[PDB]
Each structure stands twice: as C-alpha cells, then as structure tokens.
C-alpha cells in the first residue's frame, strides 16, 4: 500500500487532522444523553454534557462534512469511562463531558457510546479513508479528596468493573499523595496532582501493567493513533516504557501534549520528543503563529526563526502536530477580527512541516475565550465559508505533493509582513507566499525558487487574493504584486529517480518489530534496508513499493541507528537518523541513590551497561535525576525504561555541564523484572 493509505498507522504527515471535542460536535444518539443536572441539550451551560457522541461523528463522516473539507484524520475526546459525578466548583456544576476524568480505562464513556459504537466509528472512518486518534490520559483518574471520600467518586479506579482502589485509604499507593503541583519545577509537576485530580503512581506495578493492558485493548479495536494527555506531568522514563509496550505490540502514531507559552523554547521538551518514543503537539509553532498572525507581537522574522530553530531542535520535526488553537486556548478567531488572519494561519499551517490539526469549528469562524468558552457546540456545518474552502483546497496537497508532507523548509523571500517559503522533497516542490499586512501590498522581485520554468496557478484559485506565478530559467520568478492579505500556493510534482526517505515510524522498537519507511523513488522491486552498517534484504522486508517499505528490525545491539535504503539497482537514499533499537521489551524501574552530595548546578545522573542507560557514555546518561518530592536530597531518584529481565551493571554520575565525577568502587548490579515495576535503592560509592 502507498504511504498515503488510510492503513498507514505510523505516518500522519500526509494527513490533516480534525480535532473533535466529542460532546460538542454532533449528538447522533439522543438516547445515550446524560440526564438531569448533568445535561443541557441547548448547550448553554458549557460545563455540562450537551450530547455530542460517536454516532454523531459517524453521521458527519457519512454525510460528507469532513471528507468535503479534505480531512483525512480525526482525534476524539478520551473514550474511556469517566466518573458520573456532577461536581459543584464554587457555585457551578461541572461534569466529565470533556472525558478527562477516567474511572475505567477498559470501558467506554456511555455518553459517547458503547464498544459497538466505537467499532462502528472505526469502520465508518476507515471506509472514508479517515484515520482515528484517541485521547488517552494515564496521568490521573478524577477529582478527589483523601480526607473527604464522599467528594465526587474519590478518584476511584476500576479494571473493567472491578474496583482497584480510591484516593482515600490508598494503602496500595495506586496514587500520589504529595499535594498539588505549583508548576515550579518539572519534578514538582510530575509527582504532585494536577488541580485536584488523583495522580496515578506508575511505579506501582498494578497501575503500570493495568495501563499498558488498557492501551492494548484500544489498539486491538483498530485505533490509528494516540494523543497522550499531560505528558510533561508523568515520569518520562515510564512514558518511554509505555511507548515501548505500544510499539513492541502494535505501533501507531503517538504524540503528547506538553504546553509551551509564548516565546518559550524548552530543551526538555525537545529531548522528550527526540527520545521518548512519541512526538509532541507543536506549541512552539502554534504560539509563534498566534504572535505573527493573531496578536501582532512578532513579525515574519520570528516566524522564520521558529521554522529554522524547530527544524534543528526536533530530530523528527515532521512528526510534530501543528495547530493554531485547541481545547485549552482561546480560539484563534477573535470576535472583532478580520477573518483573513484566521484564513492565512490556516493556509500556513496546512502547507507547513509536521502534522496539521484543525480544532473543530475553526472553519465556522467560532470565537471564544478560555475553557469552557472555547468549547461551544459547533454552530453549523456549512461548506460555504472561506475557511472551509481554504482547507478543502490545501488539505489534499499533503497527499498529492510529498514536498508538503516530508519536505524541508526554506525562506525564499521575507520582510516584516511577507514570508515566501519553499517546501522540497525529491523532485517535488511547493512555494507558499503570505502577506499578513491586510492594508499594504508588497512588490515581490528577486524571488528565486526550485520550481521548473513555467506558469503556475495559485492552488487557492485566488480565494485569498493569490496570483499566478511566472517562473523563468534558474527558477527566477517574474516581478509580481502580492496583494494586501494575499496568500498564494504554487506547486510542482514529478517522479523522483533517487530513493528518498521522507518518514520512518515507529522510531523506537525492539528487533523483530516491523517499521514503516515512506518516501519516493524506492522502485517496485525489493532493494536493501540499512540499520547503521547492517544490511537487511529478502524475506525480512515484508513488502516494498515505490512510496512505502515494511521491514523487520534486525537483531542488532540496542542503540541509535541511521536508516537508509537502496533500490534494486543499488542506488542509496538519504539518511534518516535517530532510530532507536531497544535491547528488548521494556519495564519501568525506579533508581534511588543515597547520599550523593552536590554543589549548586551539579546534578546526579545514571549510566549503565545497556543502551537504555547510554552504555557508559556520560553524554547519554539518564537524568538529571530528582531530589525533592518522592525522595529528598542528598538522595536522588528517577524512573527509567530498561530491558525486561536483563542483568544490568550501573553507576551514578555527578555532572556540572559536561564535567563528570564517577562513583568509585565496583559497578552496582541488578536484574530488571520480567514485567511490572521495581525499585533499586543503593548508596553513592565514593
């Protein structure tokens, strides 16, 4: 099957996602509507259930609203059963309409539908070439008070109906009891509660095994991707072991939500996306887009800086999920704002690198402040809005032109208000011109592109005042006027003679697992696949065609490898780096080191005899470790994904910058569990 097929669960770069807040999209089955005080059929009280469900999504899939827009993927509110409590927060009733208050990860939220409804949704979507992503929030259960068990459902967690435990009398330690986070430090935000939500303890074997079993159930139901909620708030090492569980079973595109504020560029965020096994919602992209197109707090130079910086900071920038707003931000379109601002932000996002995700209702020009005002019921299903047509014209390009899906990004013209950028992949090219200045045209002369000589029509057909482009020899464009608020898209596609890799997924798994290599120019005859210097050919290459290769990871030592392919004739492709071969199945183990004193700025790290611990290379040591919440300095701790059942030797390090101080004595040793978790507690050896 081609890289663009709906069956490709490992690659969403050729897709356009539609963010569906289930309860607020379409009530297709009034019969499963919550009743009484938990419901408001008029959807005036945005904190109660309005009725939106999966039958409704099925209907909008079948009547062409989404397909007519060029939408090829959707993500939905967490599907698992939530508490049924109607909580009164300072005079106002609140319900789990948002799906974030889980009580049973192995059952569905009856308000959204039954398991059968979910199966029907998966089927209906796939029949229309639409992939389905589910929100999954393993960080917590629901609102709770240990001193007041009668409050809500006490954060109780059930396993397919069987009560496991609640926040009160939590002798099993299924949850954390360290108060609420103030977001002062990453560690603080991980081992303390978000709001009053019962924080799950992933170091508890029951919890660990339970959540991994739960996600497998959903994987078996046919989901095509996972949107991990609040990933900045769970142990990064545990999440890696989680992604390993997913990838070593049935790999599907996964990304997490890690909020970044305006002007916030986070190295931790980059590292998580680069090493966790999942990508992230591109807040850095979203926030800059809002600054430039919405709030006028930066110009095109800032937009360019964001594009160049992110392409360098993210190992797989093409896996980051882009957007201009979502369920937590104020809607991009302000009540009194010119609609062209939203339309340009949309065109920009749809033609930029990554995986575009449009928040439901954006195309209907919905406005609204922060939660819950940004979650109003979609006002209409009109295909006649300009925004709807913008998506309709550009969304399909991610499928037809690989430059948009996998291409590099290069600025070709720029000033305060204008940015003309080029996407390029193999012989494919796309040039996008945007003039955010709604009052002043711009004279574009000296524009040089990779477009072959000829005349190119604006793919938007002048919808956003774009124009035709005339390209001479050398790719030099003839002088033209870019209209005020003008947005144009010119593109070119052609066969690629040389094997070219545009995407690989998953990027982390153990030997034997099948990975998907997408691109162009692979040829129809099986060639060769390389993991580092190791060559794979023949039977282990399950299938091979021009745009997609399915190949089993060879049994090489755990580590980071460069992926490359060669066609049947032996012509080698470009290198797709940063592929992590795991040493085997993974388990999350907590390492605790006692009496490791340090100077301010100096931190303790973990190193060991397996790639998962960096194979003794300090530059790849695990950490910086923590020393405040669960354990206190001079004791440090960290949760780490390590190969199950392996006997591992390790040591701790104290690092100040790249300067390293090693534990003295012999290596520490332990054997990781075959499943579940474990805690290894040792003393720092001088």
Ligand X SMILES: OC[C@H]1O[C@H](O[C@H]2[C@H](O)[C@@H](O)[C@@H](O[C@H]3[C@H](O)[C@@H](O)[C@@H](O[C@H]4[C@H](O)[C@@H](O)[C@@H](O[C@H]5[C@H](O)[C@@H](O)[C@@H](O[C@H]6[C@H](O)[C@@H](O)[C@@H](O[C@H]7[C@H](O)[C@@H](O)[C@H](O)O[C@@H]7CO)O[C@@H]6CO)O[C@@H]5CO)O[C@@H]4CO)O[C@@H]3CO)O[C@@H]2CO)[C@H](O)[C@@H](O)[C@@H]1O
Ligand Y SMILES: OC[C@H]1O[C@H](O[C@H]2[C@H](O)[C@@H](O)[C@@H](O)O[C@@H]2CO)[C@H](O)[C@@H](O)[C@@H]1O
Ligand Z SMILES: OC[C@H]1O[C@H](O[C@H]2[C@H](O)[C@@H](O)[C@@H](O[C@H]3[C@H](O)[C@@H](O)[C@@H](O[C@H]4[C@H](O)[C@@H](O)[C@H](O)O[C@@H]4CO)O[C@@H]3CO)O[C@@H]2CO)[C@H](O)[C@@H](O)[C@@H]1O
Of 337, 440, 448, 557, which lies in the binding site for ligand Y, with binding defined by CB under 6 A?
A: 448
Cross-strand pairs, 265: none
DSSP 476: B
Interface segment toward ligand Y; rule CB under 6 A; list 91-99, 220-228, 405-413, 673-681: 405-413
Q: Per CB under 6 A, which of residues 215..244 are in contact with ligand X?
A: 229-230
Of 602, 620, 676, 678, which lies in the binding site for ligand Z, with binding defined by CB under 6 A?
A: 602
Q: For ligand GLC, which residue has the nearest CB?
A: 290
Cα-Cα-Cα-Cα torsion 621, 627, 632, 635, nearest 10 degrees, comes to 20
Q: Cis before residue 372, ω within 30 degrees of 0?
A: yes
Q: 477 or 593: whose CB is closer to ligand Y? A: 477
Q: 195 or 662: whose CB is closer to ligand Z? A: 662
Give one DSSP letter per residue of 79-136, joined into a string: -EEE----EEETTEEE-STTS--EEEEEEE-TTT--HHHHHHHHHHHHHTT-EEEEEE
| Residue 639 engages Ca ion in binding (rule: CB under 5 A) | no
Cα-Cα-Cα-Cα torsion 382, 388, 393, 396, nearest 10 degrees, comes to -90
| Residue 29 engages Ca ion in binding (rule: CB under 5 A) | yes
Sign (positive or negative) of CA dihedral 255, 260, 262, 263? negative
Angle between helices 205-220 and 236-247 (to 10 degrees): 40
Cross-strand pairs, 163: 158
Interface segment toward ligand X; rule CB under 6 A; list 137-145, 376-384, 449-457, 588-596: 137-145
Residue 229 falls in the annotated catalytic set: yes
Q: Which of 117, 257, 417, 580 is catalytic?
A: 257
Q: Give the helix/strand (H/E) hosting 471.
A: strand 469-471
3-state secondary structure of 305: helix
Q: 392 or 628: whose CB is closer to ligand Z? A: 628
| Residue 446 engages ligand Y in binding (rule: CB under 6 A) | yes
Question: In 3D, which of 600, 581, 462 has the Cα closest to residue 532?
Answer: 581
Question: In 3D, which of 251, 249, 220, 24 has the Cα closest to residue 106?
Answer: 220
| Residue 413 engages ligand Y in binding (rule: CB under 6 A) | yes
Report the partner that residue 414 touches, choosing among ligand GLC, ligand Z, ligand Y, none (CB closer than 5 to 8 A by kind): ligand Y
Q: Which two tokens stand for residue 554?
A: 């060879």
Report the partner that residue 633 touches, choosing among ligand Y, Ca ion, ligand Z, none (CB closer than 5 to 8 A by kind): ligand Z
Report the partner that residue 180 touches, choosing among ligand X, ligand Z, ligand Y, none (CB closer than 5 to 8 A by kind): ligand X
| Residue 51 engages Ca ion in binding (rule: CB under 5 A) | yes
Minimum Å distance from CB 508 to ligand Z?
A: 23
Of 651, 652, 653, 684, which lies in the binding site for ligand Z, with binding defined by CB under 6 A?
A: 651
Q: 5 or 602: whose CB is closer to ligand Z? A: 602
Q: Which residue has the tokens 């397919």?
A: 160
Binding residues for substrate: 100-101, 140, 145-147, 193-196, 227, 232-233, 327, 371, 375
Minimum Å distance from CB 518 to ligand Z?
A: 36
Longest dimension (CA), the chain: 76
Radius of gyration of the chain, Cα coordinates, nearest whole angstrom: 25
Q: How far apart are CA 624 and CA 608, in angstroms?
A: 15
Q: How far apart are CA 49 and CA 35, in angstroms?
A: 9
Minimum Å distance from CB 295 to ligand GLC?
A: 5
| Residue 603 engages ligand Z in binding (rule: CB under 6 A) | yes
Binding residues for Ca(2+): 27, 29, 32-33, 51, 53, 139, 190, 199, 233, 315, 577
Q: Contacts with ligand X: how many residues (CB under 6 A)? A: 23
Q: Cis before residue 15, ω within 30 degrees of 0?
A: no
| Residue 185 engages ligand Z in binding (rule: CB under 6 A) | yes
Sorted by sequence, the CB contacts under 8 Å of residue 216 that are 6+ apart come out as 245, 249, 250
Q: How far apart are CA 432 and CA 342, in angstroms?
A: 16
Minimum Å distance from CB 651 to ligand Z?
A: 5
Give one DSSP letter per residue of 172-206, joined into a string: T--B--S-B--SSSHHHHHHSBSTTEEEB-TTSHH
| Residue 208 engages ligand X in binding (rule: CB under 6 A) | no
Question: In 3D, which of 493, 494, 499, 540 has the Cα closest to residue 519?
Answer: 499
| Residue 415 engages ligand Y in binding (rule: CB under 6 A) | yes
Q: 150 or 533: whose CB is closer to ligand X? A: 150
Interface segment toward ligand X; rule CB under 6 A; list 140-148, 154-162, 264-272, 354-362: 140-148
| Residue 343 engages ligand X in binding (rule: CB under 6 A) | no
Of 30, 41, 64, 180, which lies in the binding site for ligand X, with binding defined by CB under 6 A?
A: 180
| Residue 662 engages ligand Z in binding (rule: CB under 6 A) | yes
Cross-strand pairs, 477: 471
Interface segment toward ligand X; rule CB under 6 A; list 59-67, 121-129, 193-201, 334-342: 193-201
Chain positions contacting ligand Y, by CB under 6 A: 411-415, 445-446, 448
User: What residues are labeled active site?
Assistant: 229, 257
Chain positions contacting ligand Z, by CB under 6 A: 185, 598-603, 616, 627-628, 633, 651, 662, 664, 667
Chain positions contacting ligand X, by CB under 6 A: 89, 94, 98, 100, 137, 143, 145-148, 179-180, 193-197, 229-230, 257, 327-328, 371
């Amino acid at each position: 099957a081609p890289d663009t097929s709906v069956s490709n669960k490992q690659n969403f770069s050729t897709d356009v996602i539609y963010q569906i807040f289930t309860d607020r999209f379409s009530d297709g089955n009034p019969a499963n509507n919550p009743t009484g005080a938990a419901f408001d059929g008029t959807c005036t009280n945005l904190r109660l259930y309005c009725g939106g469900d999966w039958q409704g999504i099925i209907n909008k899939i079948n009547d062409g609203y989404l397909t007519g827009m060029g939408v090829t993927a959707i993500w939905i509110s967490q599907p698992v059963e939530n508490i049924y409590s109607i909580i009164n927060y300072s005079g106002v009733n609140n319900t789990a309409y948002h799906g974030y208050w889980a009580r049973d990860f192995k059952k569905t939220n009856p308000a959204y539908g039954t398991i059968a409804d979910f199966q029907n949704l998966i089927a209906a979507a796939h029949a229309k070439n639409i992939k389905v992503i589910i929100n999954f929030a393993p960080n917590h259960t629901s609102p709770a008070s240990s001193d007041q068990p009668s409050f809500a459902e006490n954060g109780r967690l059930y396993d397919n109906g069987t009560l496991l435990g609640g926040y009160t009398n939590d002798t099993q330690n299924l949850f954390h009891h360290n108060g609420g986070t103030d977001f002062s430090t990453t560690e603080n935000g991980i081992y303390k509660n978000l709001y009053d939500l019962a924080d799950l303890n992933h170091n508890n074997s029951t919890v660990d095994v339970y959540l991994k079993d739960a996600i497998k159930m959903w994987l078996d139901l046919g989901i095509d991707g996972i949107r991990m909620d609040a990933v900045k708030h769970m142990p990064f090492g545990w999440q890696k072991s989680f992604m390993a569980a997913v990838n070593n079973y049935k790999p599907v595109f996964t990304f997490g939500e890690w909020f970044l504020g305006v002007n916030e560029v986070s190295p931790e965020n980059h590292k998580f996306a680069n090493e966790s096994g999942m990508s992230l919602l591109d807040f850095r992209f979203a926030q800059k887009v809002r600054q430039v197109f919405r709030d006028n707090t930066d110009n095109m130079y800032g937009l360019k800086a964001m594009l160049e910086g992110s392409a360098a900071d993210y190992a797989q920038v093409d896996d980051q999920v882009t957007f201009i707003d979502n369920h937590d931000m104020e809607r991009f379109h302000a009540s009194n704002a010119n609609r062209r601002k939203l339309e340009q932000a949309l065109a920009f996002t749809l033609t930029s690198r990554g995986v575009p995700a449009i928040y439901y209702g954006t195309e209907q020009y919905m406005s609204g402040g922060t939660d819950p005002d940004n979650r109003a019921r979609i006002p209409s299903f009109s295909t006649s809005t300009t925004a709807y047509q913008v998506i309709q014209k550009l969304a399909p390009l991610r499928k037809s032109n690989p430059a948009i899906a996998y291409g590099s990004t290069q600025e070709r013209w720029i000033n305060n208000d204008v940015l003309i950028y080029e996407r390029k992949f193999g012989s494919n090219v796309a040039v996008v011109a945007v003039n955010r200045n709604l009052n002043a045209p711009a004279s574009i002369s000296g524009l040089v592109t990779s477009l072959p000589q000829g005349s190119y029509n604006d793919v938007l057909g002048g919808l956003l005042n774009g124009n035709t482009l005339s390209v001479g020899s050398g790719g030099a464009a003839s002088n033209f006027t870019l209209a005020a608020g003008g947005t144009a898209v010119w593109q070119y596609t052609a066969a690629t003679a040389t094997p070219t890799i545009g995407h690989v997924g998953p990027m982390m798994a153990k030997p034997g697992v099948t990975i998907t290599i997408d691109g162009r120019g692979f040829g129809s005859s099986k060639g060769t696949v390389y993991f580092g210097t190791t060559a794979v050919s023949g039977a282990d290459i399950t299938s091979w065609e021009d745009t997609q290769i399915k190949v089993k990871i060879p049994a090489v030592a755990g580590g980071n490898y460069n992926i490359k392919v060669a066609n049947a004739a032996g012509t080698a492709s470009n290198v797709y780096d940063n592929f992590e071969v795991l040493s085997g199945d993974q388990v999350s183990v907590r390492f605790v080191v006692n009496n490791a004193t340090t100077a301010l700025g100096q931190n303790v790290y973990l190193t060991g005899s397996v790639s998962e611990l960096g194979n003794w290379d300090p530059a790849k040591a695990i950490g910086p470790m923590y020393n405040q919440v669960v354990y206190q300095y001079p004791n440090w701790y960290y949760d780490v994904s390590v190969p199950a059942g392996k006997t591992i030797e390790f040591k701790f390090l104290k690092k100040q910058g790249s300067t390293v101080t090693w534990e003295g004595g012999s290596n520490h040793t332990f054997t990781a569990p075959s499943s579940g978790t474990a805690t290894i507690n040792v003393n720092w050896q001088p």
